[PDB]
Design goal:
It is classed as virus like particle. Keywords: Semliki Forest Virus, Receptor, virus like particle. Structure of Semliki Forest virus VLP in complex with VLDLR LA2. The protein is mostly loops. It has no helices and 2 strands. The chain binds calcium ion (CA).
Amino acid sequence: CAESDFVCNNGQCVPSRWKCDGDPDCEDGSDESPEQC
Ligand SMILES: [Ca+2]
């Protein structure tokens, strides 16, 4: 992934925009965990 793109634990490149967005973009769903949002 590029230097400006966040990496999920599986290697998926997801923009920095899509944190706590409501959408399970990362396969493990760690970015969308309710406790950390
Ligand atoms: Ca997401």
